[PDB]
Subunit: 274 residues, 3 copies
């Protein structure tokens, strides 16, 4: 049976090999899916001029100011003037219904983050029967790409279908801080997405001191921090390394079996002593 004992060592080795193979294959199956993610933060000297698409509707733009200081100056309510920005009016068909042309007002944003550059926009809307005043706006990465790239309808259609719009209220100013997150998929595209944290500041009617009762909106756009987020869905399943380790483990089993065979020859000598 001693022959069967050496084959018993061999069968233990084979069972270990079977367990190793099945464990490794199921581990590789699991690791192919459920990839882990990594986040890296980069710094930018000055953000690329972003694009803000407003949808005022029946409300006209009173004053747009590109203010460098982090403290905007005083304002004269309902006083047209002080327009030193860039604006383009567009008529594009929303993909949702292909029946309502959603007029858009496209405006350049702030670039110099380190000088706390910000954009101040004032809007006036004559009282109506809406019962709820709101404005919806959208953000996209670059404005010069929009201006230069032909078929602007196409670019903003892609923007609207891809990104999301979050409306700001009326009757009190809204402070908006933007942040950029870049994600890479299997196709190697650096998709850019925007995030914002809002902080509404109430507006005082004491300054007007009039009976007009006309709703006013104020928006402030600013860059939160120079840091840009970059999320990568990293993959830790390397077929070549796993195959190399599998072969190494197989040959380790075989060579440990050779060591055990040398020990079993020692034991054969032992038996010969007895």
């Amino acid at each position: 049976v001693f022959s069967v004992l050496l084959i018993f060592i061999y069968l233990l080795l084979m069972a270990v090999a079977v367990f190793l193979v099945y464990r490794t294959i199921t581990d590789f199956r699991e690791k192919l899916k459920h990839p882990v993610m990594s986040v890296s933060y980069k710094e930018v000297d000055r953000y690329d001029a972003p694009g803000i698409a407003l949808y005022p509707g029946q409300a006209q733009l009173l004053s747009c100011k590109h203010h460098y200081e982090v403290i905007p100056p005083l304002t004269s309510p309902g006083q047209p003037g002080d327009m030193n920005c860039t604006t383009q009016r567009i008529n594009y068909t929303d993909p949702f219904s292909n029946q309502t042309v959603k007029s858009a007002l496209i405006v350049q944003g702030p670039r110099e983050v380190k000088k706390r550059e910000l954009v101040f926009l004032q809007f006036r809307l004559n009282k109506s029967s809406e019962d709820f005043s709101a404005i919806d706006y959208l953000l996209f990465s670059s404005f010069q790409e929009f201006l230069q790239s032909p078929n602007r309808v196409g670019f903003m259609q892609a923007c609207e279908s891809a990104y999301s719009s979050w409306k700001f209220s009326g009757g009190f100013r809204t402070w908006v801080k933007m942040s950029l997150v870049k994600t890479k998929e299997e196709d190697g595209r650096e998709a850019v997405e925007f995030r914002q944290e809002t902080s509404v500041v109430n507006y005082i009617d004491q300054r007007p001191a009039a009976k007009k009762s006309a709703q006013l909106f104020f928006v402030v756009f600013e860059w939160k921090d120079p840091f840009i987020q970059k999320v990568q869905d990293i993959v830790t399943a390397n077929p070549w390394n796993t195959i190399a380790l599998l072969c190494g483990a197989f040959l380790a089993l075989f060579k440990a079996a050779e060591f055990a065979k040398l020990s079993i020859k020692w034991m054969i000598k032992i038996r010969k002593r007895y």
Copy 2:
């Protein structure tokens, strides 16, 4: 007196082996206490009816509409009517103080994200000496489960102790989104957590145009996107692979020692040439 020269590389090799073992055990110990995080997404054609747990207390319900258009239509002030919602009133002893009982009403939330159906409901509360108005509310995964599972009080106690209880103001509309994140514990249980980003839009007192001083609440629940987040806690450095790695390193080190000793025998022949 050269056997020590032959064993010099042997002792260096054993030092290498000790260093490798210490480093590997330290790495495994560090890895067993620092699990990694992963995130996954999916496209879902129809969400499961989420829970609604408004706690009016002393404010009655005037209207609750299950709209299917992203833009709710015009609404008159006050004038209760148009009840097209499913409601269930439940009383349960608090799970924190066991002193007070908070009467709650449960509503069925939007299901179709693709049609972007919203639920728009409004409450009014007569003048009171509170001087501050606000209504609590919390969400849970499903409403049909709660309707069917007996011993409701226990389910609500668990939901309240687990899910966060948010608060929405009174006096203007609070467009509230939703989003689901699902996590798997080491046991294997699936825990679903709600998170959302509210958006406040102001009311207008012109529509009432009366001296009533009555609160007019307004809430709009809506699904954000057809993406359900999953967070997974991946554990790296499984033990069998590490053991196989260490054994293979030992075998390779010993075979390198044997090859080096054969080459040292050749070099000793060379020395014999001198």
Copy 3:
């Protein structure tokens, strides 16, 4: 030509070795640029008192109270009283411009999260021509460390440079919630950051019911959850040469090649049999 064919195993071996070296070099050179992020949550029985800094300017505090009960009490606004907080006024020059000296107040935060401790602060401000009333506040890890550490101006300069400041409006309260995120940087250092999610509730003017129309701001500070969130970036393998890995793989592969070539020598015996 049979000699070359006998070495053909060697040609394939050299190709495999080139591929393996290139793949491992590129992979482990690419694995340092983007490490892997890991997260965890720690439960804390009771937080360390944090320091809450405010910049009232022309505003004067009216009442600061700690409230262990979840529901804060109701009072008559406009009457100073019930001051049960600790404050240490400071006057320091900001780092951004080194020209504006900004007097700042500091108050003790809520410690016992389990007992539901919330800090209630009332501020009063006379009507002016500002047209936009807001107060910006900051959070630092522990007020006590500030009291103990000399050169306190330096501590707040560092705090202002590091942390971000977000303001709350004037006219309705704000129920600020706080949470702590700890991240370890590569240089053996731990950084603590504050996160929050505001929730504004409208304030009712019925209590004054007078023509003064003075501005009142109400702030509540609470702890979101006792959990502290730690995030750390960790690497994969840090050998800087990983010479042992590929060396052992190569030696194992070469010994396997030697055994297969002995088998091919048996095959040479075969060919001799023809």
